[PDB]
Design a protein around this ligand. Structure first.
Ligand SMILES: [Ca+2]
Ligand SMILES: [Ca+2]
Lengths: 266, 1072
DNA sequence: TCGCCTCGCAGCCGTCCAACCAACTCAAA
DNA sequence: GTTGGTTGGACGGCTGCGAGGCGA
């Protein structure tokens, strides 16, 4: 049997399908990084770092052995390993398997697909099978550490923030958290404000609300990226104790997708 | 008195158009050294040689070139009392001319010859040589062309009651002709007679009464046939007097030995007086056909001469590197090399160099020629183009080389010379052949053709392209390939510079001109083209000139005409075999039908004369037994069998094949020179036999019968299917094969037995023999072939075992690569090493092919691909054993990016057709390189020359330098056009090659061949080949630096497995 | 009256197909 | 001729933005 085996059927397959539903085509060209803890999907959208961690526990069965494997999601520069998780690409989808075989750095992933047929017969779509050898060498740089501040925004609150975000490099935007727990985002022509609090439309729940800060971002990318990914409300995660500060926005809907934006040094 | 018929070549000349390069005025100031002088000059044309000077047109003792001339300008320069007795003479050519009794009244011809040309008659002139090497012309009198017309049709139309009346009608139709160019003709110029003949077309055709009409002139014949009674079909009006002379005199030939003999009333050939000579010959005779006999036993060629010549020209316009145009007065012939050989001994006898301007051959050249034992070059110098060209044509007329050769002389040298002579100078050419005037001397484009009366032009370019397969047919490439004689070339780009420099450098031009003619002479005496052409001329009953230049049809036509006349006829004037592409590691036996189409014609008695489109034609005959019924193109056709009526085509083929067998039997016992002649003969017979099928199929050809042609192919197709079904039925099991061929017992290989046809073309079948070994199989194959032949087909149809492949890639119809049992590789219908590619792609492509065929691991794995449809291989691991094939691609990929790599392997090249501003598609790699050369460091430029280039990676500096100077008259994602680079620059700066460009062209090349392994599906092939290459991923350098300063951790890379694992655990914790 | 959500239209980009130029021709100079 | 870049246009799948309608 294959050393590494991944299965999605039933409830777990439904969970994954729901997670991918808002993401549309956004992740179809991506790096898949596979290890014991799950599949980390990585891409860049409008120059910004985008991640989707699919935890091992979210799969019906998950077994991994040997080193981390990385795969480009595209096979023969056409079909994607993640095309199976598009909302309506396989209407009768019933089961998906990943088998990874061979030895590093030359292992092959095989993806197999089943559809429930009349009377609930699980028939394999053999012609839709996908095969991919791992990247023989890869480097990916990944977020680490605990954020200094976390602020959870509902879908209306985040869309207000994206509207307050600057339209171009010539009109940058500032994110600030003040001594009184006032959180605010502003630029040359507009401003938005919220009352942050530790875990009523202006109330924002969070962690380390007492840690005041001011940070700036030049790019309009944060609005474009988070709309592209269809983020329906999310946690703003601020990383401040680094040479370049960073903001990670993690979605709170069906998708667990995250975009990371570099912040102007203080 | 002077000549009876005026000599039209120049024997005197005292003014001419003087054209010479001004640079020859090496005393003149630099302001007047460019361009040509072009004006008339009032003096006799002159030639200089070795410090002496002579009039070009003077004949006498001290000439600078050899002569084989008796008359010059109507003066007899023969020795005192010159009167050689002629008995035997060789004929190499035959002319056809009209003479008129009135014109010849002052010549002293015997009455019998005058009567034959009263008032006009066709004279057949045989040209050749006596054993003593005297040039002879023998004028044969009394041959008349003739055609036939149906008596009933003519009588019913013209109300004719007697042959007298018909002659009046024809004479009247010529008197009344447009342009009046026959007024003077009368019914006396014709003879009509009633004969019984049969139209050659169809079995049911009854013998009928025809008028056979004799005419005295080909001109007259051609008009009547194309204008007289157009509703009435003419027969054999196309047949020339030479053909009638040959066919109506049994045994006569167009090339061979003859004897003068007494004729009927004890008549003898009459020697002409010199002033009545029609040609540049030593002796001339008048005779009739009864004064001639073929001389048996004599076969050696007499001492004919060969001239091998080559011209050099100099473009004289604003660009000295432009191709010279004969109509441009300033574009000059500047030299002519002329080597004269004895064609019987092959000895080189004279080396002449005609030079416009003074010319001193290099001492090294002279020493080399002396060491080789060759004649010392004679250098003929001239002040002008006209003087030189006139001297050359003077040599041609006076020396009269019966055979002329060179390289591309038909398509270049002759047309260029004759354009100069005809258009610039106003020289008539019609006296420069053998005839002293009014002879044919003409070039015409189709490539191109030449006809010069009495002169057999054989262009070695034609001979070599028709005989040897080469990457280039440039003379130097040919000399390397054929003579193993590697040598240097002087570029046309060099000529203007050498020419201007002086007599020593013009001498270097001369050396290279001489060397070129010497090489051509070697090619000529290697291939001996005159011997094969003369063989065909003799067989076909046509002259050697028509043999060279007319098509295949006339050869079969003339032979058919001979037989048809003998037989009383007159000739009227006008899918299961498809291959599944794939790779076979089981042996493939090739069965080949021997001369299939000829054999079908003979076996099935096909002919014009056996065919019927009507059932009532053969209702008196027994079906099957007496005729073949066959559906062809939707029609029912009948062909009666040989015992009902024998096919004329059958007879021709049978007799030729019997003759060819007799000749090939005599060779093992023949002397070394006999072996050469017998070999040429048997080869001539083969080419004529193989043309019979084609002859019947030419719509609008001489004597078409598309019904015969179609029947041949239809029977062909059915025989191949019959061969397949017989093989399949008779040898489905090994036990059946062993019962026929018991030696097959030891031939049994381990796996399942099968014997199936996998391919078949027009005349061969490929039989895949699963479960048999390749070793005994070629021998058992020939006994299979014999057995099949016996069981299925009529003699002389023969199936033969041709070869056995051990490995075979069937690509498509007529495309395959196979290894023969002896280990040799055979490639058909594909090129592996295309000229558009760099050496890297060509070498790697060939290496992949060699691996498929010579690594059994790869071979067996490649065969295993056939077990599954092509799409399935996308979804599963490929057969184990293809690993090495993948390794070649990975190595090739790695070799592109290697900093230690030879740039020269990756160099492409493109010429500059014209200045870069004159292009429309200005995005071309070589134009990008042209402007980069200019832009950076004003690197050495180019014009009408080959620019080498390499395709380079987009290293940002290329983007910055993309602003080319062409604007003085893309900014991102650059085109291949823009990423082109000078290889010297690329070497000097360690620039990276474009991996995508080179590797995609390698995968392209691979998909031409290996696509057959995957259903001929190029996209799957490309995908599966691309999959072998290692993929890597990294963030860009700037991004990576930024993310590291943002505190991002590294995953994969050179980190340990544990570091990577832990880092991903951190990622999942942060991203959640 | 203002904000949010949904639907439609426009711009976009990648794929493919057909046509056009141009080089080897190509070999003589 | 034939082939290889290129180019320019049809078109098909997709996402974003703007406007209109409905609900609070
Ligand atoms: Ca030549
Ligand atoms: Ca030449």
């Amino acid at each position: 049997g294959a050393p590494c085996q991944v299965v999605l059927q039933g409830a777990e397959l439904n969970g994954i399908l729901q997670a991918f539903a808002p993401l549309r085509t956004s992740l179809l060209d991506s790096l898949l990084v596979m290890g014991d803890r799950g599949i980390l999907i990585h891409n860049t959208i409008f120059g910004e770092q985008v991640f989707l961690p699919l935890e091992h526990s979210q799969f019906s069965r998950y077994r991994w052995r040997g080193p981390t494997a990385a795969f480009l999601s595209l096979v023969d520069q056409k079909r994607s390993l993640l095309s199976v998780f598009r909302a309506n690409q396989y209407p009768d989808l019933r089961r998906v398997e990943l088998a990874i075989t061979g030895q590093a750095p030359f292992r092959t992933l095989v993806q197999r697909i089943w559809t429930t047929t009349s009377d609930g017969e699980a028939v394999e779509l053999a012609s839709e099978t996908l095969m991919k050898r791992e990247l023989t060498s890869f480097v990916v740089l990944v977020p680490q550490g605990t954020p200094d501040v976390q602020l959870r925004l509902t879908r209306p609150q985040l869309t207000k923030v994206l509207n307050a975000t600057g339209a171009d490099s010539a009109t940058p935007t500032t994110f600030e958290l003040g001594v009184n727990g006032k959180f605010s985002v502003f630029t040359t022509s507009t401003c938005v404000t919220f009352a942050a609090r530790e875990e009523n439309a202006k109330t924002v729940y969070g962690e380390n609300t007492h840690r005041t800060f001011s940070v700036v971002v030049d790019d309009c990318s944060m609005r474009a990226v988070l709309r592209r990914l269809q983020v329906g409300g999310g946690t703003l995660k601020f990383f401040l104790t680094t040479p370049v500060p960073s903001l990670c926005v993690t979605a709170t809907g069906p998708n667990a997708v995250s975009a990371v934006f570099l912040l102007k040094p203080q | 008195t002077g000549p009876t018929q005026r000599h039209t070549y120049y024997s005197e000349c005292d003014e001419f158009r003087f054209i010479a390069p001004r640079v020859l005025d090496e005393d003149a100031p630099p302001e007047k050294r460019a361009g040509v002088h072009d004006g008339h000059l009032k003096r006799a044309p002159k030639v200089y040689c070795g410090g002496d000077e002579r009039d070009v047109l003077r004949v006498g003792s001290g000439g600078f070139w050899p002569r084989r001339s008796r008359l010059w300008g109507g003066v007899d320069h023969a020795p005192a009392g010159f009167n050689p007795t002629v008995t035997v003479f060789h004929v190499y050519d035959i002319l056809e001319n009209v003479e008129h009794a009135y014109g010849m009244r002052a010549a002293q011809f015997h009455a019998r010859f005058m009567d034959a040309i009263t008032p006009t008659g066709t004279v057949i002139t045989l040209l050749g040589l006596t054993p003593e090497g005297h040039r002879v012309a023998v004028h044969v009198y009394g041959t008349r062309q003739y055609f036939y017309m149906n008596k009933e049709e003519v009588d019913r139309h013209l109300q004719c009651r007697a042959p007298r009346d018909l002659c009046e009608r024809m004479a009247a139709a010529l008197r009344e002709s447009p342009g009046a160019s026959f007024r003077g003709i009368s019914a006396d110029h014709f003879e009509a007679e009633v004969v019984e003949r049969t139209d050659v077309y169809y079995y049911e055709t009854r013998p009928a009464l025809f008028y056979r009409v004799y005419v005295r002139s080909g001109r007259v014949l051609s008009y009547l046939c194309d204008n007289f009674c157009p509703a009435i079909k003419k027969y054999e009006g196309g047949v020339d007097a030479t053909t009638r002379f040959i066919l109506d005199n049994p045994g006569f030939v167009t090339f061979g030995w003859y004897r003068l003999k007494p004729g009927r009333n004890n008549t003898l050939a009459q020697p002409r007086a010199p002033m009545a000579f029609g040609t540049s010959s030593d002796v001339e005779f008048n005779c009739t056909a009864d004064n001639l006999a073929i001389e048996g036993g004599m076969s050696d060629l007499p001492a004919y001469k060969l001239m091998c010549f080559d011209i050099e020209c100099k473009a004289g316009g604003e660009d000295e590197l432009a191709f010279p145009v004969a109509g441009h007065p300033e574009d000059l012939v500047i030299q002519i090399s002329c080597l004269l050989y004895d064609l019987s001994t092959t000895a080189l006898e004279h080396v002449l160099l005609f030079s416009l301007g003074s010319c001193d051959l290099p001492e090294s050249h002279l020493n080399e020629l002396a060491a080789r034992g060759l004649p010392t070059p004679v250098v003929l110098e001239f002040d002008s183009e006209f003087e030189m060209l006139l001297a050359f044509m003077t040599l041609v007329k006076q020396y009269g080389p019966e055979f002329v050769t060179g390289y591309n002389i038909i398509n270049f040298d002759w047309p260029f010379l004759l354009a100069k002579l005809t258009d610039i100078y106003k020289v008539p050419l019609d006296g420069y052949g053998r005839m002293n005037g009014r002879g044919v001397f003409r070039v015409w484009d189709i490539r191109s053709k030449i006809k010069v009366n009495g002169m057999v032009n054989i262009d070695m370019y034609g001979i070599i392209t028709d005989k040897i397969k080469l990457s280039s047919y440039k003379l130097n490439a040919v000399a390397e390939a054929v003579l193993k004689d590697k040598k240097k070339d002087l570029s046309y780009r060099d000529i203007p510079a050498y020419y201007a420099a002086g007599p020593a450098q013009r001498g270097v031009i001369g050396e290279y001109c001489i060397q070129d003619s010497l090489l051509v002479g070697q090619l000529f005496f290697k291939f001996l083209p005159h011997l094969e052409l003369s063989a065909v001329a003799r067989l076909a009953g046509i002259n050697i000139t028509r043999t060279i230049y007319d098509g295949q049809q006339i050869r079969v036509f003339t032979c058919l005409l001979r037989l048809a006349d003998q037989k009383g006829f007159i000739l009227p004037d006008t899918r299961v075999l498809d291959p599944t592409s794939g790779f076979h590691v089981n042996p493939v036996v090739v069965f080949d039908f021997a001369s299939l189409y000829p054999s079908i014609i003979q076996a099935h008695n096909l002919c014009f004369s056996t065919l019927s489109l009507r059932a009532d034609a053969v209702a008196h005959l027994e079906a099957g037994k007496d005729y073949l019924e066959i559906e062809v193109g939707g029609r029912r056709l009948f062909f009666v069998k040989a015992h009902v009526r024998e096919s004329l085509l059958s007879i021709l083929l049978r007799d030729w094949l019997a003759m060819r067998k007799q000749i090939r039997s005599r060779i093992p016992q023949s002397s070394p020179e006999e072996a050469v002649l017998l070999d040429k003969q048997q080869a001539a017979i083969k080419v004529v036999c193989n043309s019979v099928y084609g002859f019947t199929g030419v719509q609008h050809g001489l004597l078409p019968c598309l019904h015969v042609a179609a029947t041949v192919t239809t029977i062909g197709r059915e025989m191949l299917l019959a061969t397949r079904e017989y093989v399949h039925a008779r040898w489905a099991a090994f036990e059946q094969l062993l019962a026929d061929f018991p030696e097959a017992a030891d031939m049994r290989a381990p796996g399942p037995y099968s014997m199936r046809i996998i391919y078949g073309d027009t005349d061969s079948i490929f039989v895949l023999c699963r479960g048999l070994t390749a070793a005994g199989l070629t021998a058992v194959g020939d006994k299979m072939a014999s057995h099949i032949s016996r069981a299925l087909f009529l003699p002389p149809i023969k199936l033969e075992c041709e070869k056995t492949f051990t490995k075979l890639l069937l690509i498509a119809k007529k495309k395959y690569i196979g290894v023969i049992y002896g280990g040799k590789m055979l490639i058909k219908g594909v090129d592996l090493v295309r000229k558009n590619n760099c050496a890297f792609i060509n070498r790697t492509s060939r290496a992949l092919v060699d691996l498929l065929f010579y690594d059994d691991t790869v071979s067996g794995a490649a065969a295993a691909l056939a077990e599954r449809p092509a799409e399935e291989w996308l979804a599963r691991p490929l057969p184990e054993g293809l690993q090495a094939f993948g390794a070649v691609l990975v190595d090739a990929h790695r070799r592109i990016t290697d900093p230690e790599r030879d740039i020269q392997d990756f160099v492409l090249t493109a010429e500059l057709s014209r200045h870069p501003r004159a292009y429309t598609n200005k995005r071309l790699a070589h134009l990008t390189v042209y402007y980069k050369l200019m832009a950076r460091r004003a690197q050495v430029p180019s014009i009408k020359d080959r620019i080498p280039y390499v395709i380079v990676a987009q290293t940002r500096e290329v983007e910055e330098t993309v602003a080319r100077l062409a604007a003085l008259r893309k900014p991102r994602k650059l085109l291949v056009s823009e990423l082109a680079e000078d290889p010297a620059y690329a070497i000097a700066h360690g620039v990276a090659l474009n991996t995508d460009y080179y590797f995609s062209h390698l995968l392209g090349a691979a998909c031409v061949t290996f696509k057959a392994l995957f259903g001929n599906n190029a996209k799957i092939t490309e995908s599966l080949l691309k999959r072998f290459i290692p993929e890597v991923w990294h963030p860009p350098d700037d991004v990576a630096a930024r993310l590291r300063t943002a505190g991002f951790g590294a995953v994969g890379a050179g980190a340990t497995a544990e570091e990577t694992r832990r880092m991903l655990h951190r990622a999942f914790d942060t991203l959640a």
